[PDB]
Symmetry: C4
Subunit: 355 residues, 4 copies
């Protein structure tokens, strides 16, 4: 594999159609899904030359831990959909690569099992109708050694996934939400209906700023709000005591027509003015994309779909190869741009171009 | 049906070619028709997160009536072209959905029959060569319980519809202008000539600001000027006593090269500064599009062609299904954007993107 | 014919390939040729509503003569290439339509014959190596009743027409420059070489501001400089005593990469501030395009290729039909935009859109 | 050949696939490669009219030598890949055309042999791990009569060339780095690996500002820094004593996502404010492109790939024909734009357009 695109081709070959669609798809007309790519493609970097590159390092310190790259594996629910080893395969590869792994509320292997892999993991939280279940998950995550709580704030309910609706997508019997008893809702098959979407409407309570405060009071871990796009919500996140935010439109899966995170990132970085870490996701497909995100001010990126392509294609080894490729591309891009550190990359300037 | 696009496919299958073309087409090169879509596709919403969504409502108050959505059915002439029940089918579905229905001057069922369906309808006015006929129509509409007069101001005559000209389109014998004796002009078949266009040139007198004043003096109902695009015309509409305007290029059917309404909407909303309701139409094809229009400042939208797709596909039940789908999409988009009310949606910010 | 595009299709059918290419083509990569269309397509008009349209007139006064439309037939060399009646057919149709016709220095029928058709024609001047021949042409034109001298200033030599080079294009024996003895240069056939281009390099002297003054001193007729794109050249044209300019890139046939005239027009109109007439050409293909040009400030447009399509398709009657179609489209567009006169159309505002 | 595009077609026919790919390709997704073309295509020139063109000259003075055009042949490694005569063929044609030729550190014929051709050549420097080898090359170049040192500053290592990786590209046995003993690294064949890229990582030391000073102190020749894109790096180049810079993204072969040089050129020209020569390269494919670069402020351009197309197609004679074509196109474009000298072309204004 010489690019991430090689992995998508590999994953389309092996996965069942409806599972590839669950992975690839977005909400509505997929405008936001496509815009995440368009937005990155329009950014050009203004590289610097003739700087010392005798010790180029791609490492960052984030949430009290050194990471090998300015990158983490995004939370992706139900990883057993893509490979039998699911989250364990991805977590092992991430650990070995020195990349944080985000354990999901809707993981198909229990959070404690995934945490036992090691690698100082993060935990993604969905707010549930019974608050106590969500706060218990936070405490479980913390007890298990997770190092940050990534509270997803852009899913009061699931978006309208037309591929899933048309496919009548439902979880296979052998994939479950291992952190719960989540009931049978996501497994029932109904025509023209996404079973996971009606499961979400039944199970999820919309989170509010009060929910954020309840989480912040319940843990010593940094709380990271994922799904922020409005500048004032970024500012309020800092005021609320968040240790970070992820500037994100949920991979185009939530509001169709939501601005790409990459388009809000610079304005958000300026507004928070170092008050929290500012991550971004959506459409990161190369080390050069990582560099672009960094140059726009991101502390780090998340990568979602490509990690699942690698998992589907070749399990743990596939994820390892993806992370090695990304690591090489990030090092390459940084050095070619005159950056011996991620901090230097954040000081790069950019210019918008066309198509 | 999981999107409005499903209905267009359904309608193309069933309708005769020349009738589908009468419905789908625009004037000239169809530049304005296409631009209505392009304009919406370039707008991205900046959603808000973590707000209370315990009682999301899509309702608005407009022209003294609560509507279930920030949407009305646009005036579309000659609905019996699309289904035998024509306007009655659409009006019944709109009534049941709590959506205002606009009865047309050129309705193929009489305005009194359509009004008798109930649902507190609006009445669209074309100015006719004999003024008295137009003012009599206004009084008929008011007597029949219509709640607003939507005076269409962008048709001094009909645009050059090249599809209709090439098809030699004429009304079938069984479709007539039921509010009149409209003569035989729209039924005569002449090669290279749109019969409806030469009927319009013969029948319609260009409206002026004096015509608006004559209407305003003849009724207690709110007068809504449909087809406003210039900021100064919006301002003058308020000065003239209009209760609303519809910012519109008539679905790309009138001046080819007219700016899309969606491109003028924000500037118009700022200029009228709450002095009248500001509606928009042209290319609204989803709840997300409704949200975009609302975020740009619209009080409500009109929807034209999709309602006719639904009517053609499945009559009253088709229109019902379309309105239920739109209602769900509007609720979904609003909540995902952090808006518990349409007023909150109007306070959303937007950002232009590419393609 | 219901659009100008109908005529291009008709002309491609009938004309020999190399002649269609001589007509259609531009210089270099044809970037400027395509940009002339792109530039118009990006302009949208903001129409006005509710104005008095009881006496819509498309007439203008220009160079001391009333014209039926804000339009003239552009100078196009060698019209016998397209139809045996050549310039006489086009001039007769233009006369009958009340549209000025521009007689070319390189007309294939003598300027006196074309002038005898009537219709108060204009005369286009190329500066020749022997100055006296060019000044004699000016005096011939004036003696014959031409009413303006359109001095083409963007052809110090002919552009690189790659279609003509690849075709080895040369004039047929039966088409000559009837105002001269122009020699045999444009008729000799050489592979990979445009015979008309090497004829031009041999025959034409580059014009300068001194040439303009020589012409201005030699005639009482208004001198109109065709091919102006720089704002300072427009200003200097006024200072030099020009009665008009044509803002033009010569239909993309001269400098490949020259800005479209339509893109410079507004700035030029502002800079000359009523000091001369400001015409534009390049890519005008409808009455709506005329309206756009007018709204950007043009006094009038020239139309080139479409007139030749009409000539090729159906001779004099073809040109008549084209001019009738354009007249109807201009009237239609003006009225739909709320303009009872061309002056009102010049006061319309515009907005740039995308694709 | 009537355009440069004719030569690319000719070269694709004759060259082996992997060699054409080594020539044509860029790094990563080839975003920067494509953007070099897009960037030029968006620029339009505002030509001037009516200026004296009695002695149009395309000549410039640069680095103490008159050049026939504002153009030099870019450094392109390993020219024997394209034709058996390699660099000698290109250098002879450049000499005969009066165009500077840039001899490469990685030339496949020794720099002294190429210099012996005559034509006052330039020498391109790569910084090598043993500094002394690079400084010895500079002294060899100077002793051999090279007139400028073009220090390439954008290759701390070679970019990720995915075409070369996929092809497993390696130099054929009969092509070597003739200025060295360069070892066997670039010839070894490894699957999924570019042999030239791992040779570069092994052989090249990243250059720094200290390296620039070492070169500047070692020669009396002008030092020209090739690969500058940041405005502050251009300013620093002047402060460092550079006689010129080449604003360049290395033909899209280095950082994928690097801004095109043409997009930075105007800002760089303003910032250096005559303190050094400012050249540009990337995607120059016609005399009109040269004119655009000049109008944006360039002193001269480099041309890379097209020279190799010509070499591959027809050897020395091919390169001669390419340079004659470019010379004619530059003269044509300049005159059509009203420029009797390159200095006048630099005073032209430009306007951005679309696609
Ligand atoms: C199949 C799938 C499942 C996901 N599950 C979750 C989730 O449970 N929680 C969450 O916060 N985000 C979830 N996401 C969103 C990702 O964390 C991330 O925002 C998005 O995938 C990033 O875009 P990318 O896929 O373009 O890299 C999911 C994304 C995908 C594709
Ligand atoms: C077939 C058809 C007939 C129409 N008839 C009328 C009419 O009689 N009066 C009017 O004001 N607008 C009329 N319109 C314009 C619509 O009210 C509306 O402005 C346009 O359809 C909105 O764009 P949309 O179709 O993209 O939703 C008509 C539109 C169509 C497609
Ligand atoms: C075949 C052809 C011949 C032309 N001959 C002349 C000419 O002799 N003199 C001149 O000033 N312009 C000439 N032009 C340019 C036109 O006057 C005009 O600028 C251009 O055609 C306008 O663009 P349009 O063809 O897109 O309408 C010619 C154009 C064409 C296509
Ligand atoms: C096959 C190839 C080899 C090259 N070798 C070198 C090199 O050895 N040194 C260097 O500074 N640039 C090198 N370049 C970059 C060129 O000098 C130049 O920047 C680029 O080709 C200009 O873009 P163009 O090819 O679009 O004209 C090379 C380019 C190509 C295509
Ligand atoms: O985007 C998703 O699919 C993910 O965020 C999700 C999956 C299942 C679910 O119930 C809710 C959200
Ligand atoms: O756009 C239309 O077709 C509609 O507005 C209309 C229909 C018939 C007519 O005579 C005049 C206008
Ligand atoms: O654009 C043209 O072809 C026209 O302007 C022209 C024709 C013949 C010629 O010799 C010089 C110019
Ligand atoms: O772009 C290139 O290929 C050229 O700059 C280069 C060639 C070989 C090499 O080892 C290093 C650079």
């Amino acid at each position: 594999y010489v690019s991430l695109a090689d992995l998508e081709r590999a994953a389309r070959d092996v996965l069942p159609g409806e599972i590839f669609d669950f992975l690839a798809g977005g909400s509505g007309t997929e405008a936001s899904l496509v815009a995440n790519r368009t937005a990155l493609e329009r950014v050009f970097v203004i590289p610097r030359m003739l700087r010392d590159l005798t010790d180029v390092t791609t490492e960052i310190d984030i949430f009290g831990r050194r990471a090998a790259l300015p990158m983490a594996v995004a939370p992706v629910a139900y990883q057993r959909l893509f490979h039998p080893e699911g989250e364990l395969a991805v977590a092992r590869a991430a650990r070995d690569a020195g990349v944080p792994y985000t354990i999901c509320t809707l993981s198909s292997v229990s959070l404690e099992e995934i945490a036992a892999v090691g690698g100082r993991p993060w935990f993604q939280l969905y707010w549930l109708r019974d608050e106590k279940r969500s706060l218990d998950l936070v405490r479980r995550a913390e007890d298990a050694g997770c190092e940050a709580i990534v509270f997803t704030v852009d899913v009061p309910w699931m978006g309208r996934r037309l591929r899933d609706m048309r496919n009548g997508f439902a979880l296979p019997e052998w994939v479950t939400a291992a952190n719960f008893d989540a009931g049978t809702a996501a497994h029932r098959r109904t025509q023209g209906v996404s079973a996971v979407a009606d499961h979400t409407a039944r199970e999820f309570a919309p989170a509010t700023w009060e929910s954020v405060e309840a989480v912040r009071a319940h843990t010593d871990l940094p709380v990271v709000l994922k799904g922020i796009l409005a500048v004032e919500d970024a500012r309020r996140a800092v005021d609320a005591g968040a240790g970070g935010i992820v500037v994100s439109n949920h991979g185009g899966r939530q509001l169709d027509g939501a601005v790409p995170g990459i388009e809000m990132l610079g304005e958000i970085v300026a507004a928070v003015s170092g008050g929290c870490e500012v991550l971004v996701d959506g459409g990161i497909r190369s080390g050069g994309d990582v560099l672009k995100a960094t140059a726009l001010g991101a502390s780090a990126v998340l990568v979602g779909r490509p990690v699942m392509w690698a998992l589907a294609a070749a399990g743990q080894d596939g994820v390892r190869q993806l992370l090695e490729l990304l690591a090489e591309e990030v090092r390459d891009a940084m050095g070619l741009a005159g950056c011996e550190s991620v901090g230097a990359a954040r000081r790069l300037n950019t210019k918008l171009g066309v198509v």
